[PDB]
Specification:
Elements: H1 16-29, H2 47-50, H3 62-69, H4 80-90, H5 96-107, E1 115-116, H6 117-127, H7 135-151, E2 159-160, H8 162-169
Antiparallel strand pairs: 1-2
Helix pairs in contact: 5-6, 5-8
Length: 183
């Protein structure tokens, strides 16, 4: 967490200065629960420390964002290796498939993989919706989703892995292209 030395496994879309700027942001994020003595490294940064700054309050996905980043147990959460691998998904450079995989992992909340077809159709629309969709564009892309539900067969199945459904949206629709951050 606090040092740049011990085994950072980061196959990532950030160069040497982008990593150093993101480390300075992680160092401003680190000290309140560990304030002066920096002891619990692969454990802090927690959700109490993410909730500490102004615009992380009425954002309903901030604990879901933290859980896809690392986490599993309470307070043992986003280490610096997790801190680079997460923002690499949103880097303006990274692929539309890794951004659609992250949109899946927000709706698939309790560990497993199999979400409901309604949460899958809401995942594709909560993207196509942010990225410039009027009433004729939303009807045309939901008629496109009805054909992607036929051959990745939804009646008989019910609960679904989006691993198949992201590779079929990587043809065109829609905000999986610009699901991105400024670093």
């Amino acid at each position: 967490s606090k040092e740049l030395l011990a085994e950072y496994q980061d196959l990532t879309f950030l160069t040497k200065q982008e990593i150093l700027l993101a480390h300075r942001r992680f160092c401003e994020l680190l000290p309140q629960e560990q304030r002066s003595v920096e002891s619990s490294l692969r454990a802090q940064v927690p959700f109490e420390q993410i909730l500490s700054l102004p615009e992380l309050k009425a954002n309903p996905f901030k604990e879901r964002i933290c859980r896809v980043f690392s986490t599993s147990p309470a307070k043992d959460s986003l280490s610096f290796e997790d801190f680079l691998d997460l923002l690499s998904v949103f880097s303006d450079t990274a692929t539309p498939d890794i951004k659609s995989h992250y949109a899946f992992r927000i709706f698939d909340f309790d560990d497993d993989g199999t979400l409901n077809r309604e949460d899958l159709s809401r995942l594709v629309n909560c993207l196509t919706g942010e990225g410039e969709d009027t009433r004729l564009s939303a009807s045309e892309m939901k008629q496109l989703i009805d054909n992607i539900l036929e051959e990745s067969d939804i009646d008989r199945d019910g609960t679904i892995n989006l691993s198949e459904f992201q590779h079929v949206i990587s043809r065109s629709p829609d905000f999986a292209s610009s699901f991105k951050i400024v670093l």
